[PDB]
Design a protein around this ligand. Structure first.
Ligand code: DXC
Length: 392
C-alpha cells in the first residue's frame, strides 16, 4: 500500500531532475562569459542570467502545489519535465540577449515542479524512514550540483562550446523522463474539486502575517544571499574582473564550497550533541567573521581576491551549520501546513535572491570590489539583526 524495496527506480527519476535543474545554473554561469562575448551587450548581463532563471521559480511556485492536488501528481510533474526539455533546446534558436532572458526565465519556472509536485509524491507514497533516506540524498544533490557543476562548467568551455550543455541536460531530464513515462504512480486525492484560486491566497495570508515566520524567512533569505551573489558574479569577478583563467578561477569555487559542506558534515555530527537554537548561534560566528573578513579585507586593498574568497569560506562553513537548522524553525514557526509554509518561504527567499543579486550587480560595477563585500556585510548585518529578535 505504501513502500517496499523494488520500485526504487522511480525516486532516482525525481532525484535526476533535481540534479539537472541546479547545474542548469551551476555550470552556465562561468560559461555565460562566452554567451556574453557572442550576444553583444555587456558583462553586466553575465549574472543577470541566474537572476531570470531564479525569478521564474517563484512564479507558479504557490500555484503548482495546490494545483498538483486538484488535477493529479503524474500529469503535473510530466508537464514540467517536458517543459524543461522543450526550453532546454529552444533556447539555442533565440540568438539575442534581450530574449535570452525570456527562455532562461522559462527554464526558471521549471523549478517549482521539483518541490510543489515532485517532493509531495514522496510525502504521499513512501513511508517515514523510507522517505528519510530519499531526502538526505536530495539534500546532497542540491549541494553537490553547485559544488561540482562549476568544475565541469570550466572544462566544458575549454573542450567544447556553451551550446553543448543545453542539450546534455534536455538529455539528462529525458534520461529520467523516459524513466518516468511508464513509472510514475500518482497520489493526488483532490481530483474533482473546484477551481478555487480566487480564495487560495487566504491560506497564504495566514503565514504571510506571522511576525515570527516572515522574519525567520528573511533571516534565511538574506543570510544565504552573499553565497549566491558570488555564484552569480564569480565568472566576472574573477575571469574578467580579477583577470584569471578557468583553472585559477574554478580553483576558488571549491575552497568556498568544500567549507560549505564541512558545515554540513559537522551539522550532521552535532545535531545529536547540541540543540537547534544553539547550532544557529554556533554557526552565526564563522559567517559573522566571514562577511567581516571578506569586506574588512577589500578596504584599502581592492584586489586581494584570495582573502575575499578566503572570507567567503569562514562565510561558507557557517552557512552549512546555520541555514539548515534555521530551516526547521522557520517551518515550525507556523503551526500550519508544510506545503504552504514551504510555498511562502520559497516565494520569499527568491525575491531576496533575485532582487538581492541585482542590487549586488551594480554594487560591483560602480563601487568596484569593495562595495560588493559591504553589500555582502549588510546581509550578515541584516540576518543577525533578525536573529537578535528571532531567538530572544
Ligand atoms: C526548496 C527546497 C526544498 C526541497 C528539499 O527539501 O530538498 C530546498 C532544498 C535544498 C535547498 C537549496 C540547497 C542549496 C542552496 C543552499 C543555500 O545555503 C541556500 C540556497 C540553496 C539554493 C537552497 C534553496 C532551497 O531552500 C532548496 C532548493
Amino acid at each position: 500500500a505504501r513502500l517496499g524495496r523494488q520500485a526504487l527506480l522511480f525516486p532516482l527519476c525525481l532525484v535526476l531532475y533535481e540534479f539537472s535543474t541546479y547545474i542548469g545554473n551551476d555550470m552556465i554561469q562561468p560559461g555565460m562569459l562566452a554567451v556574453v562575448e557572442q550576444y553583444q551587450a555587456g558583462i553586466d548581463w553575465v549574472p543577470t542570467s541566474m537572476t531570470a532563471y531564479l525569478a521564474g521559480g517563484m512564479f507558479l511556485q504557490w500555484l503548482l502545489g495546490p494545483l498538483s492536488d486538484r488535477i493529479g501528481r503524474r500529469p503535473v510533474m510530466l508537464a514540467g519535465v517536458v517543459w524543461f526539455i522543450v526550453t532546454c533546446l529552444a533556447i539555442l534558436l533565440a540568438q539575442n540577449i534581450e530574449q535570452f532572458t525570456l527562455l532562461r526565465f522559462l527554464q526558471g519556472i521549471s523549478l517549482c515542479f521539483i518541490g510543489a509536485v515532485g517532493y509531495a509524491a514522496i510525502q504521499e507514497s513512501f513511508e517515514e524512514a523510507v522517505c528519510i533516506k530519499i531526502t538526505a540524498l536530495m539534500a546532497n544533490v542540491a549541494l553537490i550540483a553547485p559544488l561540482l557543476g562549476p568544475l565541469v562548467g570550466a572544462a566544458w568551455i575549454h573542450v567544447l562550446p556553451w551550446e553543448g550543455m543545453f542539450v546534455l541536460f534536455a538529455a539528462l531530464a529525458a534520461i529520467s523522463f523516459f524513466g518516468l513515462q511508464r513509472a510514475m504512480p500518482e497520489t493526488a486525492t483532490r481530483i474533482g474539486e473546484k477551481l478555487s484560486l480566487k480564495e487560495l491566497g487566504r491560506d497564504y495570508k495566514l503565514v504571510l502575517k506571522n511576525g515570527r515566520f516572515v522574519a525567520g524567512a528573511l533571516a534565511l533569505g538574506f543570510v544565504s544571499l552573499p553565497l549566491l551573489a558570488w555564484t552569480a558574479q564569480s565568472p566576472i569577478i574573477i575571469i574578467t574582473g580579477e583577470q584569471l583563467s578557468s583553472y585559477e578561477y574554478g580553483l576558488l569555487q571549491v575552497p568556498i564550497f568544500g567549507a560549505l559542506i564541512a558545515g554540513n558534515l559537522l551539522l550532521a555530527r552535532l545535531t545529536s550533541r547540541r540543540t537547534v537554537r544553539s547550532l544557529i548561534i554556533m554557526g552565526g560566528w564563522p559567517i559573522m567573521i566571514g562577511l567581516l573578513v571578506a569586506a574588512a579585507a577589500t578596504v584599502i586593498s581592492s584586489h586581494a581576491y584570495l582573502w575575499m574568497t578566503a572570507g567567503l569560506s569562514i562565510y561558507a562553513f557557517g552557512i552549512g551549520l546555520a541555514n539548515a537548522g534555521l530551516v526547521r524553525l522557520t517551518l515550525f514557526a507556523s503551526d500550519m501546513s508544510k506545503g504552504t509554509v514551504s510555498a511562502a518561504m520559497e516565494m520569499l527567499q527568491m525575491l531576496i535572491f533575485t532582487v538581492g543579486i541585482e542590487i549586488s550587480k551594480h554594487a560591483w560595477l560602480n563601487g568596484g570590489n569593495g562595495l560588493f563585500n559591504l553589500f555582502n556585510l549588510v546581509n550578515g548585518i541584516l540576518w543577525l539583526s533578525l536573529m537578535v529578535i528571532f531567538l530572544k
